[PDB]
């Protein structure tokens, strides 16, 4: 866990730019399966 916090601070999520629901994510994962 030495570099895990550095990985946390590194990741670039500041711009979302997506613009649903978690059950929709469930069926998307099942469909991908």
């Amino acid at each position: 866990l030495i570099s895990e916090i550095s990985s946390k601070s590194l990741h670039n999520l500041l711009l979302s730019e997506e613009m649903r629901s978690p059950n929709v994510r469930e069926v998307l994962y099942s469909i991908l399966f």
Binding site: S3, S7, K8, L10, H11, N12, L13, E18
Partner: peptide, 30 residues
Amino acid sequence: WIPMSELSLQQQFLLVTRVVSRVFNALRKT
């Protein structure tokens, strides 16, 4: 934190590629 169950396919790709890139950088000094 913003836990792992909230990100997307490309964001999970960046997570897993950061993990394997850390493993790579740890292994390339051998």
